[PDB]
Design a protein around this ligand. Structure first.
Ligand code: HEM
Ligand SMILES: [Cl-]
Length: 393
């Protein structure tokens, strides 16, 4: 028998304080039934991690949101990559993997680091900044669209585009309804920047499009792959970075450790990703009857994975509720795991690294000073505003 719970993990109350209810999702049993949305979920590390690693049994091609693409109409034409199963996923995955290769990262590290240092310098002149608008938002908007090869005009549509994409994986609540009602201009902006003549030479977009010349992909597939990175590749990194700064604001000890060995920057970032888990949840759909956590679940059933919970499971993590910048963070699910593991993880790490490295060197203290405000989203977890005073080194 599977435990029934009344917890609504897509509700404003849940978002505002998820941690008690997350314990209850874990502690009820390895598999629970969410009364509210009529679906099964798993919130322990072990089940979440095992579900990721068996795409044959737990498919994505039926949507990674509540909606089941076999029975219901997708809100937009499905992602080629996020919403496909091997073998179909493989070709496009390989395409995005080359575009975002370690080697590509080497070519862009220095520019990214330069901006990250310039950015921090600038903020110290001001003293009082908002770590979201001025830092977690400004910094990635300052490097990632250029790196994509996007034109100046229309950029304002990127963050709201992401929000919509991420609201849409959820149940049909007001967050979701409202996002879709207001989708058209964002979609029209992105559909236009996905086109070849609009991506600057040598940027991710053009680089994507080059795969059409070799036959690696069709002229039609290219824009839809550009659309993938315009969906997933900004807002996550905004929330990951905001997580990191939020953490070092709350954990002064850890900041001094980081100041003390700036080479901890990359791992300090990884640890914020675990701890806050920017992307909180994703679904899968069973392709057969399957035993998971000791319960038998039938074919064609949606299963909710609580990535952020898994990342806080005391079964897997020593002292899960602590931000610890030397934690062996290897194994966390914040980026997913297995075939679909975040193909953009290296851009994200690069942003996080250099930002935390610049904060490491240039800043001696980071204090919260003001109302912290949360941003509600069906999938993404993060802040709207985090007012901080930065003390210079
Ligand atoms: C802190 C930042 C980020 C986080 C936490 C994050 C999180 C994730 C997670 C959890 C998955 C797994 C999806 C699944 O299993 O169904 C994923 C996949 C994906 N990510 Fe990210 N991501 C981040 C940044 C980025 C960036 C910078 C890009 C691109 C530039 C990106 C693009 C993608 C794409 C295209 C997929 C689909 C991969 C596939 O299905 O093979 N993400 N991401
Ligand atoms: Cl779209």
């Amino acid at each position: 028998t599977i435990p029934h719970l009344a917890i609504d993990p897509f509700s404003l109350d849940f978002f505002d304080d998820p941690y008690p209810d997350q314990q209850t999702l874990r502690d009820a049993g390895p598999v629970v039934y969410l009364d509210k949305w009529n679906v099964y979920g798993v919130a322990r590390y072990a089940e979440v991690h095992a579900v990721l690693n068996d795409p044959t049994t737990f498919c994505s091609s039926r949507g990674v949101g509540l909606s089941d693409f076999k029975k219901e109409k997708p809100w937009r034409p499905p992602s080629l990559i996020l919403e496909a199963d091997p073998p179909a996923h493989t070709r496009p995955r390989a395409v995005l993997s080359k575009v975002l290769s370690p080697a590509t990262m080497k070519t862009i590290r220095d520019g990214f680091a330069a901006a990250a240092d310039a950015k921090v310098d600038e903020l110290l002149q001001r003293g009082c900044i908002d770590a979201i608008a001025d830092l977690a938002e400004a910094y990635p908007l300052s490097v990632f669209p250029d790196a994509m090869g996007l034109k100046q005009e229309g950029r304002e549509h990127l963050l709201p585009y992401a929000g919509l994409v991420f609201n849409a994986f959820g149940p049909p609540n007001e967050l979701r309804q409202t996002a879709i009602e207001r989708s058209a201009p964002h979609q029209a902006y992105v559909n236009e920047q996905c086109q070849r003549p609009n991506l600057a030479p040598g940027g991710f977009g053009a680089c994507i499009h080059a795969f059409t010349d070799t036959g690696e992909i069709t002229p039609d597939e290219a824009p839809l792959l550009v659309r993938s990175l315009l969906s997933a590749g900004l807002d996550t990194t905004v929330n990951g970075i905001g997580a990191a700064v939020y953490c070092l604001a709350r954990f002064p000890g850890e900041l001094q450790r980081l100041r003390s060995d700036p080479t901890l920057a990359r791992n300090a970032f990884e640890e914020a990703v675990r701890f806050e888990s920017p992307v909180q949840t994703f679904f899968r759909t069973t392709t057969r009857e399957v035993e998971l956590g000791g319960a038998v679940i039938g074919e064609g059933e949606k299963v909710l994975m609580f990535l952020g919970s898994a990342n806080r499971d005391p079964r897997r993590w020593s002292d899960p509720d602590l931000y610890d910048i030397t934690r062996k963070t290897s194994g966390h699910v914040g980026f997913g795991s297995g075939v679909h593991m975040c193909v953009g993880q290296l851009v994200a790490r690069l942003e996080g690294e250099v930002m935390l490295s610049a904060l490491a060197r240039k800043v001696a203290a980071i204090d919260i000073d003001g109302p912290v405000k949360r941003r509600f989203n069906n999938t993404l977890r993060g802040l709207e505003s985090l007012p901080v005073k930065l003390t210079p080194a």
